[PDB]
Write a protein that binds this ligand. Structure first.
Ligand SMILES: CSc1ccc(CNCCO)cc1
Length: 330
């Protein structure tokens, strides 16, 4: 089997991407944030504290003839950005882009943090990291991809995120028309539950390439590109007037600037992030100071190849017995 679904930016900055997901019988369609950095499929629901729902579409399990309460199961997750959510668990039928899993754990939120309440466009998350990170207790549950994998034509999914435009998540096949050149595959460590890999270095604009190992994660659920302080300083030094602002929480730059590109290495291959992809707009409405899309990982503990990086590539999440990642230009 295969599935194919369009993923759409939630706003004009590409702050996140939502993908429609069918849950239950009859189907209830929710727009979920596909997150290769976590492993829970959770949704706003009829159980979510009313004051914490502000425009999201909810899953109502009592209206699904295939929903079953998973007895005694609860979940609670805290994300790297400080967001969180928790609740109880159903199993139900879940379909993405024509690919169906029966008996998928659907984690129904009773509580969500304010950042989720305030994002009316995100109805929940669909985790695509390794199932060792799933938070359901006392019996850990599998991700949608792990449940689908054996049925798929090939045990893979691909992320093709757009810049200011829709893109695609495919399951079970590699669309050879969606990229240019070849796909370069690179080793993955699953020891932390992430799609963790080692970039071979970087360049800023037309500058020479610096060969240096950068361990980090491929994370579709993180907006920005978080890299070591040395790398990020080298980037922003090429932008007149850019500075790290403690009050704003990262590098900012004059909105009148034209930003240089940023290149990262995948083996001997090179993925070029155009400068415009690094512009996250005014720090507050009407400001002429703009927020940068490349930020230091120093306070995070891991480097993160988030959407800024991934949307410059066609990315293969290869779930073979030994997982690997593939990157192609597009
Ligand atoms: C409030 S919207 C939101 C979307 C995705 C995630 C998962 N990624 C966490 C690290 O960036 C957290 C919050």
């Amino acid at each position: 089997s295969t599935g194919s679904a369009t993923t759409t930016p939630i706003d004009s900055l590409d702050d996140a991407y939502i993908t429609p997901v069918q849950i239950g019988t009859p189907a209830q369609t929710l727009n979920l944030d596909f997150d290769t950095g976590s492993s829970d499929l959770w949704v706003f629901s009829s159980e979510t504290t009313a004051s914490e729902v502000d425009g999201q579409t909810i899953y109502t399990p009592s209206k699904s003839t295939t929903a079953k309460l998973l007895s005694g199961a609860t979940w609670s997750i805290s994300y790297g950005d400080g967001s969180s959510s928790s609740g109880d668990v159903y199993t139900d039928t879940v379909s993405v882009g024509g690919l169906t899993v029966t008996g998928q754990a659907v984690e129904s939120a009773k509580k969500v943090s304010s950042s989720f309440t305030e994002d009316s466009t995100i109805d929940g998350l669909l985790g695509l990291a390794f199932s060792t990170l799933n938070t359901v207790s006392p019996t850990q549950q599998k991700t949608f991809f792990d449940n689908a994998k054996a049925s798929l034509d090939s045990p893979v999914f691909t992320a093709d995120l757009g810049y200011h435009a829709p893109g695609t998540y495919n399951f079970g096949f590699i669309d050879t028309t969606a990229y240019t050149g070849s796909i370069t595959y690179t080793a993955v460590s699953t020891k932390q539950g992430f799609w963790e890999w080692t970039s071979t270095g970087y360049a800023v604009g037309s500058g020479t390439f610096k060969s240096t190992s950068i361990d980090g994660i491929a994370d579709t659920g993180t907006t920005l590109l978080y890299l070591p302080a040395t790398v990020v300083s080298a980037y922003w030094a090429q932008v007149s007037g850019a500075k790290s602002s403690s009050s704003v929480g990262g590098y900012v730059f004059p909105c009148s600037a034209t930003l240089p590109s940023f290149t990262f290495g995948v083996g001997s291959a090179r993925i070029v992030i155009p400068g415009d992809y690094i512009d996250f707009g005014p720090i507050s409405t009407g400001s002429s100071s703009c927020f940068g899309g490349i930020q230091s990982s120093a306070g995070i503990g891991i480097n993160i190849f988030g959407d800024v990086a991934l949307k410059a590539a066609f990315v293969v999440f290869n779930g073979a017995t030994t997982p690997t990642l593939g990157f192609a230009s597009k």
